[model samples]
Target: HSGMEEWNFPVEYDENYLPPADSRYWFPRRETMPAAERDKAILGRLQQVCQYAWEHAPFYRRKWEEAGFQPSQLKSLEDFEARVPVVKKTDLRESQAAHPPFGDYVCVPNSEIFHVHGTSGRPTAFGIGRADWRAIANAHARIMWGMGIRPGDLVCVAAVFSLYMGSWGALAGAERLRAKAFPFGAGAPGMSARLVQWLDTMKPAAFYGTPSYAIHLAEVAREEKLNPRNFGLKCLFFSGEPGASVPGVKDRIEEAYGAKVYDCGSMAEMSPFMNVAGTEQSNDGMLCWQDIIYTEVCDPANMRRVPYGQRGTPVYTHLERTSQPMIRLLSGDLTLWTNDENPCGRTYPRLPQGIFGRIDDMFTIRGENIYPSEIDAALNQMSGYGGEHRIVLLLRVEPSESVHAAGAAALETFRTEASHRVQTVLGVRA
Candidate 1:
């Protein structure tokens, strides 16, 4: 049905909203709308979601009352920005623990829900009403289409189909595009072997998964003495990790599979397609859909807006979400805004290099706070490592104890060179 046949866009939708004629955008006009018109739409939807949350969710009402703010008090975008206190994962977690299962954050009733998605450990649940599921499908469909997945294309989805949102979201997006989807679920034993067999027989045109797993599939092909580039994949779509946005990682994946890689990002609480890479092949920045999401790069300590080109935490507000409206939710992701517009002509705010790190992931070393992604970037520049590494922080030791970590090694001499490169590049004793 393409899902568009079932789309029941609100009566409040603007007739003037139009996108470029050549663009394959779902909401074409909205993507290239003027800042004034875009902001007006964003603010209007923001106020509506805020009011809906206040009336339907007791969690939001109490929180706003405690903060001495009201939805009616939000007269303008500036007022909403200043007065609305940001929501956090802990708040939602505690609410769910107190309320059980669905929590006080969900705006829709149980009868209206189509599914539930959640994260693990101190777990939080997000409900999706039927309409909200349709919206999710529609938004991700635009993202997939933008990434070059077209009608009749065969896409292999390697994401998990448990309580997590990735698998269902990918399937919905593919269905909406009229694309044939093959769900090769990740985590099942021997799934990679099965994936290779299917790739040889099914001849899917696109592959979708985390960047690391994509690389793992390449490794699996090599183990079978098969060339991944000959697997017939033309496009690679990745999320659930930052590797697709890393230049070295992206290059390696593309080289291994002979496919073009596209990156997208979202938090579990936020919509999955909040940020998407622009159409220009060389453009590294992912454009935020400002019509549906209000994004700000802010100083994490004070919540003040950082200047363009400076790295800060990404805080997001869902402008049009109805089932589980996340207003001013702190994502904790480190992002930098670029002043340069994408040549593709989308005027939305672009986060260059996507999320490099998280605020909570920062570790201090001799008064120097370091993000693990900085080390990843440094490793990306050097050779010998296959791009799989982990950062270990040992907190119990004294200040002089240098942290020990391991990088991938195919040769003894390569590890030695990689260790040397790490020490020299970081200017730290490894």
Candidate 2:
């Protein structure tokens, strides 16, 4: 039986719902409809949304005008890049500065919002319309359920609820799971450890949180010799940084508490956009959720679609959302489509590995592009280091620079020497 066959989407095909087993939805699931049809529907729909974004969101409207595009200009995806301007985090911040919290992304009036929160800094309250909250919560439920989270279990979430979407979204996901969530919220390790001790007393079957925080909690538990396994935690649903997915990272949590570790990817806009667990399509990297999103890959430099096997940054468009529909939004992560050589024969396309890294998170040193994850990988190769190392960037010149700066000729020579050494040994430059 097809794995995706299990899910019965509530909306018609237009609802943008897809099953976990659907191969076409590797993030955005562009393959669900033929290119021509998908292009026509999306281009037409987003044109209206773009118009809303432009006219109401002055920041975006000003940009469209600067780009010499009007909402009427978008007839197909061919015109997508030409007409729709890219909206980044900076754009959202500018909107908040101008309009206050919640920005113009809200397609509804201010009263329609139910609550507001941000990923960083001070938290804000947002009020969601009944319709929008239903939509958001449903999407969240689908994701948590697909992760093998059941309705009757007790779930312990340790993510910080401060000003971020992680706790809010996880709360929604837990509701969808129908589980009793022990909202430990977030605190220091000692407090978190005490909370875990309470969870053990209460008997939670699962846990939810970021890998780093979870590991730190485990470290505290280990120091105190607290046996988390006594709680019989079956799974650790993770996000808020990719600690759970990395091998040693996952291993450390599992060893400390003894449970299965699953990685889930999400943004403030949607829940579990990419997940791996309780599904046929999973590996070391991210697996796509075809039903809810329409994903794509494109050349960041020129906005052209990259070959399936080639690497590029991720771009996404939401399918099931109406209060706020995302169309061709660029997600900062970098990845390439996998070649489909897995033993599972899932046929669902995949990023060779999900979330290779982020665009801005990468930097150039002497022309070589560097991602911090690469440096982390290099440090991992040291047998003694394990999870004990950290990487930081500084603005100081390398010793090689002064040593070889005898003349202009020495400049090129030493630059090459320094870059080669770093790349060869560290698999990263700068």
Candidate 3:
């Protein structure tokens, strides 16, 4: 039971009692399949999902019809995802544009959706019904709980919460986990000050924000002569980018705050996303969740599934969420998957090291396509670098076929001696 205390806006959950809401791992249980029989049931559900989409969704129905495929053809998960084309961001954008607002992707009625939020750009919105929203909230609660958060604890989340669902999900998740949630809506500097002020007055047990901003808060706390360690914060959950996963970034942050930091990756698109429950002693960790999400890492160019230990664009399938249906939704993030050989024995699939970067954000310097994350790794490897860095892909005016080749060469040069060295000294990469 929740205590008499009004839980903070960014709630935390007790890991022991956290409930699993994701459908992928649990559909097996619901259908009465034993552990050995789990895969078969999941495949069956996947086939049904494919069949439903192929029949109801116009965008998918047309493509499947053109290929002359039937629902019965998808007897296996491979067949379901393969024969049926995986929808891309552009495809979703087009479909949503055609329908306007939330798009025709809603499998249920529009009135069912109870929550509304958007991303940074043109404000693409998503609708989550009460049930779906609760499911989403529960999923995040489990994530936080697994990462060492507890109910009755106070948490501060500095995020773009106004138009984004992440901050809201974190808050709702806190409620589910029984933790107090603090919605620190943007303002990195102001949020840092408030975190210090909160520590002085409220003494929150945990904090959540981007990896960069979290580090910034620690710096500010030190500047203000506030001992972050004494705030009782056991963990710092990070989102936005791969900052929490990187060795240098995580090290600098943990050192600055003297608390364990974990990476929780989510999107404005998918309500229930991935997060790390604890700090990894090393880079070997998985982005684990229960039945809420089914994830696949595949080579973007050919759609070939990558090995569990390898890297690719993370195309995720949200199993439990019903509000905004995302089946094999291309996250655009290029990430690797690894088994969570957790020191804690938590059995969630991890995002190898966490999100490397986005597929669309990747660039071919010469013949090699490189992600900004890779560049970031090289740049941040050196000492004295901080803050976010941007990469601009410059294309040739009358581009030759080998322009990509030329760009690759330029990137190699910059990523190596010249650029990395320059940023290391400047503290801000160009």
Q: After superposition, how far is residue 255 of candidate 3 from its true place, in Å?
A: 1.5
| Candidate 1 lDDT tens digits, 340-429 | 656656668788788777787677677555666566666666544565666673312111112233322334455455567667644566
lDDT of model 1 at position 188: 82
lDDT of 2 by residue, 203-250 (tens): 777787888877777766666677767778877777666555566776
Q: Least lDDT summed over 10 consecutive residues: which range in candidate 2?
A: 5-14
Clashes of 2: 17
Taking the tens digit of each residue's C-alpha lDDT, what string does model 3 give over 1-430? Answer: 1221112222232334533543222112321223224345446556656656655566667656776776778776667556655667677677778877777776557777787777663557676777677667766765676565666788876666776676787888887777887776666446667668777677777777788777666678778888767676677777767777777788887777777877776566766764333333333344544345556677887665677677787666665644556777777777777763545444445665677666766655555556665655555554323334554643112223343256877444444544545445333434
In model 3, what is the error at residue 212, expressed in angstroms?
A: 1.3
- In candidate 3, what residue range of length 10 has the lowest lDDT sum? 1-10
Give the candidate number with the greatest lDDT.
Answer: 1
* Candidate 1: residue 362 lDDT (0-100): 72
Give the better candidate number (1 or 3) by lDDT.
1
The lDDT for every candidate, in the order shown, is 0.72, 0.58, 0.61
RMSD of each: 6.1, 7.4, 9.0
Preferred candidate (lDDT higher): 1 or 2: 1
